[PDB]
């Protein structure tokens, strides 16, 4: 029995307004006990212009938090939401991830970080999210990736890195997945994938490589070419199966058409 009006728990008027919408309330200065806070299992505040989620610390049951097209700077209030299952942070201008914001959310099944101005990931952010199935990182401004950033997500089956500025993938960045069936790398800045980066994705059915500046004059492309040739029924585009979507750069010829004698290691 602490009869505490909503607008003190949540300083953000719009955010408190989603609470007033979440509990079936009449005004916004009404009192709310902790008991009714713990009736909140899902907070869809998609597209509602919220600046700070300060106060969401005290909603112990959010299993479904989707905050889209907002103005979020500070998601540090989200690391105590252990029962978070689906997290969807879209359209927000957050430039960076706190080291260890996701450490606690061990029940995460799907994590959609989309359309933020992310330029790097921390060295180990995903390390504790071992039950992760769907990881969607698309439309970020990532350029490089940390080593073994995915080495802990052993249950992953869908990984979306499309539409970033990935210039190169780290050696064997994909070695410990083995369950991934869908991997997207389209619309990125890759010249070449590491020798044998896809060699252990023995559950893979859909992959997208199109719209990359693949460098078919360097000898590092050879691996990609001999892989597309082996698995053409694996490569997709926009319509269907297009294993020719992985075009070279400046010639627009299919990657899988590159022959050994048509490159030179002296270049790269």
């Amino acid at each position, epitope marked *: 029995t602490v009869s505490t009006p909503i607008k003190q728990i949540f300083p953000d008027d719009a955010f408190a307004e989603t609470i007033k919408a979440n509990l079936k309330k009449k005004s916004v200065t009404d009192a709310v006990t902790q008991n009714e806070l713990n009736s909140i299992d899902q907070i869809i505040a998609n597209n509602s212009d919220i600046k700070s989620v300060q106060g969401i610390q005290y909603l112990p049951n959010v299993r479904y938090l989707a905050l889209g097209g907002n103005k979020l700077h500070d998601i540090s209030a989200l690391k105590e939401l252990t029962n978070l299952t689906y997290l969807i942070l879209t359209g927000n201008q957050l430039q960076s991830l706190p080291n260890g914001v996701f450490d606690k959310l061990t029940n995460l099944k799907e994590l959609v970080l989309v359309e933020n101005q992310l*330029q790097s990931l921390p060295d180990g952010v995903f390390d504790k999210l071992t039950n992760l199935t769907y990881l969607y990182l698309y439309h970020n401004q990532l350029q*490089s990736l940390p080593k073994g950033v995915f080495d802990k997500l052993t249950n992953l089956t869908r990984l979306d890195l499309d539409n970033n500025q990935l210039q*190169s993938l780290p*050696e064997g960045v994909f070695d410990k997945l083995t369950q991934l069936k869908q991997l997207s790398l389209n619309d990125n*800045q890759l010249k070449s994938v590491p020798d044998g980066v896809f060699d252990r994705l023995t559950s893979l059915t859909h992959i997208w490589l199109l719209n990359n*500046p693949w460098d078919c004059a360097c000898s590092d492309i050879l691996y990609l070419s001999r892989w597309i040739s082996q698995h053409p029924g694996l490569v997709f585009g926009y319509l269907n199966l297009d294993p020719d979507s992985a075009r070279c750069s*400046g010639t627009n010829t299919p990657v899988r058409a590159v022959t050994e004698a048509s490159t030179s290691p002296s*270049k*790269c």
Partner: antibody, heavy 120, light 105 residues
């Protein structure tokens, strides 16, 4: 491998300059071309980067109203147009690559440099 | 915006040399810093990339040190062709920012 910048200019204040950078020796369309300003006397200053594949471009907010970056993938050239000139733009300008190799990130090779002089 | 400070604009040394040039960032650039040798009338050479790597063709004489906020370029037997102006560049975050330059005696 080498980047070859257009020849020197001398323009009156308020007028236009567009300079060129002709890539040679690698695959121009798969590696980004940064642009750097250097005034006689003080350090370097970064202008922008325009990657000749899309081609999109970040500018440094000090320059965003001046520098315009373009490229023609056909002739392996990146261009930089600086308008309208004042006399603080009197400097040497450079273009240089951003080459990667999985774990090798650098600028690699710089162009010889385009000198710009501006006065009456 | 990130700031690279080169705590010494001028150095002094003589062949069979000893010098170390420091360059400290205002924020945390994570191992992403490069060093450039620029002697007059020339475009900068690229000496070291990503904290510690000798860009191909650079002697064992040049070594680069450090990570985080604090970076060093150490040069050993300094020789007559090593007299030039060295500066550092962070390419972690944006805008890319340089150092002040350090000209050697």
């Amino acid at each position: 491998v080498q980047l070859k910048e257009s020849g020197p200019e001398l323009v009156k204040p308020g007028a236009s300059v567009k300079m060129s950078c002709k890539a040679s020796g690698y695959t121009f369309t798969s590696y980004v071309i940064h642009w750097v300003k250097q005034r006689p006397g003080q350090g370097l200053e970064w202008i922008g980067y325009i990657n000749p594949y899309n081609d999109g471009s970040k500018y440094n907010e000090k320059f965003k109203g001046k520098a315009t970056l373009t490229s023609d993938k056909s002739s392996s050239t990146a261009y930089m147009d600086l308008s309208s000139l004042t006399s603080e733009d009197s400097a040497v300008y450079y273009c240089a690559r951003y080459g990667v190799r999985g774990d090798y990130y650098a600028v690699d090779y710089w162009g010889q440099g385009t000198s710009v002089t501006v006065s009456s | 915006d990130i700031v690279m400070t080169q705590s010494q604009k001028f150095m002094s040394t003589s062949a069979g040399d000893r010098v170390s040039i420091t360059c400290k960032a205002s924020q945390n650039v994570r191992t992403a810093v490069a060093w450039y040798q620029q002697k007059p009338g020339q475009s900068p050479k690229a000496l070291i990339y990503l904290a510690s790597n000798r860009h191909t063709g650079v002697p064992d004489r040049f070594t680069g040190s450090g990570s985080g906020t604090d970076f060093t370029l150490t040069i050993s037997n300094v020789q007559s062709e090593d007299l030039a102006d060295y500066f550092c560049l962070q390419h972690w975050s944006y805008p890319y920012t340089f150092g002040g330059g350090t000209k050697l005696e």
